[PDB]
């Protein structure tokens, strides 16, 4: 950037978006930076707008192109265009490779119900050898159970034969499925929906300490979301983080025991960035979108609104979303999960 | 989707502002949950999750357990005719 | 259509699932999107286990 | 009592060849059964637009006239244009 | 001679337990060995020019300036466009 100047100093999604808007409108533009840095805030005492919203009402700016959330309080002062990118409160969790050694994974080939059902056939056949021929008969039936299944009676001959065919299918089934997970590992959790994330307390979850995300659950009158709010309100320690950079940094150092709820635009962007561990799971929780702002009664309000709808129909917006998210994405998980 | 008003209509902007109020108060998502999920005929077909099970099914192994006890019972039936002969 | 009954005066407002398009934005005034959607995939979930 | 445990003079080759026979059958049963468990372990088909476009067993189509079909027509994305060129030339009509 | 054929009441449970341990190892040998023969089976080997672009383990590039590099640039074909988008931003310089 030090060796550049003008508008070519910056790059990103909104940088390409500003060139397309000016191309269909036919004006020259200049890319400026907001002073205070924090946009869309109106003080409760002074009622003075700040950030980029205040620069349009106070005439210090003509138009604004940035990820600005469309709210009702901002619509009463400036003009908002139609949404150019939809998003919503999504779930961000670290991708569990698993990569899951242990003793619970040893009895994984057969199921929890077969390991505990084969023993019912063990003691069931060792007790038939008592009947076909106690401290020496169980001593013998176990010595007749190890070696497949002194049995001169025809009754005891077919007991060791069916037990031989019975243990054959179990050991063939043990080998067959034990090869099915050293070949393909899903593997395969954890549930992607949000209602499943609330019904358990093993893995914690929280949102930002102050913002639109926390207020969504506070006043929500839906049954699923209200139980999520009564949890985070009485969840110790503090499940809320100071900034968005601390919430993403808390999921990475939690061994898959903490989740973070945030917008899907930021969630989908982190998934395609190093160290390539976060993965958006399940659908979003609410419906919201960004937009472009113009002053009320300005000469560029309607002309820019009609231009964005022309961009979305010609597949230009989705081509831009696929540009700075997945094409130029540093995703190494798409190369580490298939190797 | 959206609501449409004629160009230069009086009730244009008031309705536009009234939609943003219903959305942030959650009235839109509540109404979406009403005629779709609540009054839906498949409200149970939206909670059960289908995932890739790791272990081996018990049903296939049952076919082996029903052929084993079927031999144990047939074995005890031949045990009685050999004790009398 | 419903957009017709607004430009031709036979009605005052149209409330329905009306897709926000550019060709319609040039003739009438659209509100903010009260419901987001997109093209998806419908498949009959198996129903394969036997 | 000689079958439950594998299989003199003449009777040696009887149980000798019988064991090799039932060796391959219990080897074929174990080898064949492992293949059908690994196939279903692969699946799928996974929820995505490309996995719908990567295969052609489970066909796919849209409405004949509407904004859905016009999407894939003028779309300049690699994954979607592949779906358009498929349905545009898919027979019978999807 | 009691170790080959699988495995007193004390020694009888030595016979039963020694088998279930060696039964899992031979299965863990058989099952795991099938995973390394199925692996290779998924070679390329030796693939097509398109599948060369679908993976990033083996890097690929052309000359820095010539008729070959310009081909991938203005190629509107989806396959060659995916190749060009990779080689253009692949670091280090391919
Ligand atoms: C490092 N090991 C490891 O990561 N796993 N263990 C193997 C496994 C392989 C052989 C044996 N004897 C036991 C476990 C396994 C067996 C299974 C299964 C999944 C696995 C994968 C993981 C749990 O699903 C069903 O069965």
User: Does the distance separating the beta carbons of A313 and C33 come in below 8 Å?
Assistant: no
> What gap in Å lies between CA A146 and CA A158, rounded to an integer?
16
Six-digit token pair at B20? Answer: 């943003």
Across-strand partners of B2?
A: C18
- Which atom number of ligand 1 is nearest to the Cα of residue B56? 25
Q: Is A26 in the pocket of ligand 1 (CB under 6 A)?
A: no
Q: Is A102 in the pocket of ligand 1 (CB under 6 A)?
A: no
Residue E49 three-state SS? coil
Closest C-alpha to ligand 1, atom 4:
A101
Count of CB atoms situated within 10 Å of the CB of E63: 8
What residue numbers bound the domain in which A48 lies?
1-91
Torsions phi, psi of A81, nearest 5?
-85, 175
Residues with Cβ within 8 Å of residue A299, at least 6 apart in sequence? none
User: Does the distance separating the beta carbons of A305 and C22 come in below 8 Å?
Assistant: no
* Cross-chain CB nearest to C21 (options A289, A305, A309): A309
| Residue E40, Cβ density class (10 Å: 0-12 exposed, 13-18 middle, ≥19 buried) | exposed
CA–CA min distance D72, chain A (Å): 9
First-to-final CA distance of chain E: 63
Cis ω for the linkage preceding A21 (within 30 of 0): no
- Do the Cβ atoms of A300 and A65 come closer than 8 Å? no
DSSP E47: -
| Residue B22, Cβ density class (10 Å: 0-12 exposed, 13-18 middle, ≥19 buried) | middle
Six-digit token pair at A117? Answer: 């059902």
Q: What is the resolution of this structure in A?
A: 3.8
User: Does the distance separating the beta carbons of C26 and A82 come in below 8 Å?
Assistant: no
- Do the Cβ atoms of A145 and B55 come closer than 8 Å? no
Residues of chain A with Cβ-Cβ distance to E16 below 8 Å are: 142, 145-146
- Do the Cβ atoms of D75 and D84 come closer than 8 Å? yes
Closest C-alpha to ligand 1, atom 21:
A181
Q: Is A181 in the pocket of ligand 1 (CB under 6 A)?
A: yes
Residue B3 three-state SS? strand
Task: Specify the CATH number for the domain of residue A81.
Answer: 3.40.190.10
* Buried/exposed A39-67: b ≥16 CB within 10 Å, e otherwise: bbeeeeeeeebbbbbbbbbeeebebbbbb
> What gap in Å lies between CA A329 and CA A124, rounded to an integer?
61
| Residue A28, Cβ density class (10 Å: 0-12 exposed, 13-18 middle, ≥19 buried) | exposed
From the CA of B54, how far away is ligand 1's center (Å)? 9
Residue of D nearest to A148 (CA): D5
Residue B13 three-state SS? helix
- Which atom number of ligand 1 is nearest to the Cα of residue A99? 4
> What gap in Å lies between CA A3 and CA A19, rounded to an integer?
22
DSSP B55: S
> What gap in Å lies between CA A244 and CA A208, rounded to an integer?
7
* Cross-chain CB nearest to D78 (options E30, E31, E81): E81
- Do the Cβ atoms of A249 and A66 come closer than 8 Å? no
- Do the Cβ atoms of D78 and E81 come closer than 8 Å? yes
Tell me the best of A181, A187, A188, A189 to mutate to test the pocket of ligand 1, counting ligand atoms within 8 Å of each CB and taking the most: A181
DSSP H/E element including D36:
helix D10-42
Touching subunits of D (3+ CB pairs, under 8 Å) are A, C, E
């Amino acid at each position: 950037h030090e060796m550049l100047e003008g508008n070519e100093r910056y790059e990103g999604y909104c940088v390409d978006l500003a060139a397309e808007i000016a191309k269909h409108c036919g004006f020259k533009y200049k890319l400026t930076i907001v002073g205070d840095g924090k946009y869309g805030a109106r003080d409760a005492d002074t009622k003075i707008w700040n950030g980029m919203v205040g620069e349009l009402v106070y005439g210090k700016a003509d138009i604004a192109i940035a990820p600005l959330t469309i709210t009702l309080v901002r619509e009463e002062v400036i003009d908002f265009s139609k949404p150019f990118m939809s998003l919503g409160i999504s779930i961000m969790i670290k991708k569990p490779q698993k990569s899951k050694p242990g003793v619970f994974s040893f009895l994984d080939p057969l199921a929890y119900e077969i390991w505990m059902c084969i023993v019912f056939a063990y003691i069931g056949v060792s007790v038939v050898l008592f009947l076909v021929s106690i401290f020496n008969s169980l001593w013998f039936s176990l010595g007749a159970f190890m070696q497949q299944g002194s049995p001169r009676s025809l009754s005891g001959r077919i007991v060791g034969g069916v037990w031989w065919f019975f243990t054959l299918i179990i050991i063939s089934s043990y080998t067959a499925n034990l090869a099915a997970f050293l070949t393909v590992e899903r593997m395969v959790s954890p549930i992607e929906s949000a209602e499943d994330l609330s019904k358990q307390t093993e893995i914690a979850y929280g949102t930002l300490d102050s913002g639109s995300t926390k207020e969504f659950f506070r006043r929500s009158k839906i049954a699923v979301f209200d139980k999520m709010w009564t949890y985070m309100r009485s969840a110790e320690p503090s499940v809320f983080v100071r900034t968005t950079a601390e919430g993403v940094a808390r999921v990475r150092k939690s061994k898959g025991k903490y989740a973070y709820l945030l917008e899907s635009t930021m969630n989908e962007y982190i998934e395609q960035r190093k160290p390539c561990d976060t993965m958006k799971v399940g659908g979003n929780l609410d419906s919201k979108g960004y937009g472009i702002a113009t002053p009320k009664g300005s000469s560029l309000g309607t002309p820019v609104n009609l231009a964005v709808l022309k961009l979305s129909e010609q597949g230009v917006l989705d081509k831009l979303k696929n540009k700075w998210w997945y094409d130029k994405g540093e995703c190494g998980a798409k190369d580490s999960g298939s190797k | 989707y959206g609501i449409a008003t004629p160009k230069g209509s009086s009730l244009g902007t008031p309705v536009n502002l009234a939609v943003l109020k219903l959305s942030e108060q959650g009235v839109l998502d509540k109404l979406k949950n009403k005629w779709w999920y609540d009054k839906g005929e498949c409200g149970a077909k939206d909670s059960g999750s289908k995932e890739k099970t790791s272990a081996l099914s018990l049903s296939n192994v049952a076919g082996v357990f029903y052929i084993l006890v079927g031999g144990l019972g047939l074995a005890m039936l031949v045990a009685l005719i050999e004790f009398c002969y």
